[PDB]
């Protein structure tokens, strides 16, 4: 098997689909790897370090010559698509809704793509979950940015000039990203609170030292009347916060509004919102994606591409995810795609140009 | 027969701090003092006018500000419009830094003003609660570490997921005074492996206490030969090369900052390394640093922040205000203007009286 690795082109993308250490392991297992000149520069991995790992550092669009497996972060642009070579498998993030044009080009070229956002949440696939690994990065950076943006200390502090209270941080949406925001805001010494409609998620928060927000109806269909009492109770909680980190996203849908116009009016001047849901529209009505705005003294930040900010580790984890996915793409140095495997069945978005996952057929 | 204290809006570009905050203003008032605050003075620090009025002060207009009376409390030194309006016998209290504001210092003596300079508070134990250099350095240190994390392309903490385990980042703090100690405490909380470099052993002792590993050089921490300098340098250089982040904090009053990250030292940093150079305001500890900017050479991101305190404006102002409050006990008796001129703190910090410059280096520069 020969595995190709492109230099990412999407504006502001700094990650690389494989890193040198991972490349070595693929080589030591009998695989061959070609890496575009400069592909790991965003992640501080020089061409020489790849060569050392046994890769040949080729020129772009010489890249797909050998060509059994194309490993990307973002979906491949057209220059690469055209260069595919029949029977090749594309493996990376696809995001049909964000990159429809490139998706229609992949099927027109009759290509085969395993979509990374489509890895199933089963335990056997945990080590392959790139959404999770990238969400961890995003979570960590959410918290760091919350501290950079806030005009107060996160930790409680005593000096000869007195003592200062710790900051009050609420994380809303306690999935993988939110858990790491909790872990990181807690490390910095903030009082941290957690809001999620699911009890299991809230138990995870409690475990990391976050105080769950308890609403009049408890975590696990609801009346318009019951919604109102939840809303008013959450509103009072949010008002008392020094920082809000919102992470609630729903695949192929607009993000839910969790920070409502009337909720935002009650935030004190000097509060910070780090809205991780900006990519799909934002959990907060104030948020302008990719920007930091300030209204009524409320600093609101909607980061896109946090993973690419932490490019060294984001790439390392992602590289490992792909390597771990490889055991079902590669057998004994050979190209042996386990088509019958549930992971591959769930993640295989198209085979020879035919679209195998419903919603993607609809958009096209 | 009862003292009045003025507080301006800061003008210096990018200054967001306020010399007094509302909670502090109330204590001054509740002790029988009056306070006049310029409209908007606390906005940088998210303290609305109404919070000051609530605390018992009159939110007046600028340039009406000094009419009232006796004490001008500032963060940065007062610009000219304010110096011109002083009122004889009145005291200016704040940061002065003549090397940065010579012109304004010249205007202050021309107007025969009296000024207690905040950077001149003596380092004695009784003056600890009054030390604004120290309280501001704590702010600077904390943010140094936060920015180091924002800028680094790797995790600070060691981490395990189903995708593997990741080593903690390796952070060196060079210059272990007040800012350095806070950078340590904060890089530590974030789970970095933290190392500490300082020519003084007591400072290194304070680092160890916060969980930082001291950098041990061939000649040990406390008359040094050129030969002995070479081996310290080469050893430290080996240490620096192994780091993911360098935070440098070494400053010396009224001098260029010492170069602690030499050009040969910088040459050995791997691409992806971060330098937060807290000494940019006086020239930078690192040869690469461009003050107020983030540069990237040979893949090394180097940041030289000016006015970190003003980024943390809520807490910087709070500690500063308390510092000023605490200094009051020597400026104010039972609500009346009573300067204790014979106090060591006051004599150490009194930069000028009725136009007479009473602190050498400032006389010399002027």
From TrEMBL, chain B:
PROSITE patterns according to UniProt: ALADH_PNT_2
Coiled coil region boundaries: none
Pfam families, per database record: AlaDh_PNT_C, AlaDh_PNT_N
GO cellular component entries: plasma membrane
The keyword Signal is assigned to this record: no
Occurrences of domain Alanine dehydrogenase/pyridine nucleotide transhydrogenase N-terminal (ranges): 6-140
Binding site for NAD(+) 1: 123, 125, 178, 198, 200, 232
Family: Belongs to the AlaDH/PNT family.
Reported function: The transhydrogenation between NADH and NADP is coupled to respiration and ATP hydrolysis and functions as a proton pump across the membrane.
Protein's name according to its UniProt entry: proton-translocating NAD(P)(+) transhydrogenase
Organism ancestry: Bacteria, Thermotogati, Deinococcota, Deinococci, Thermales
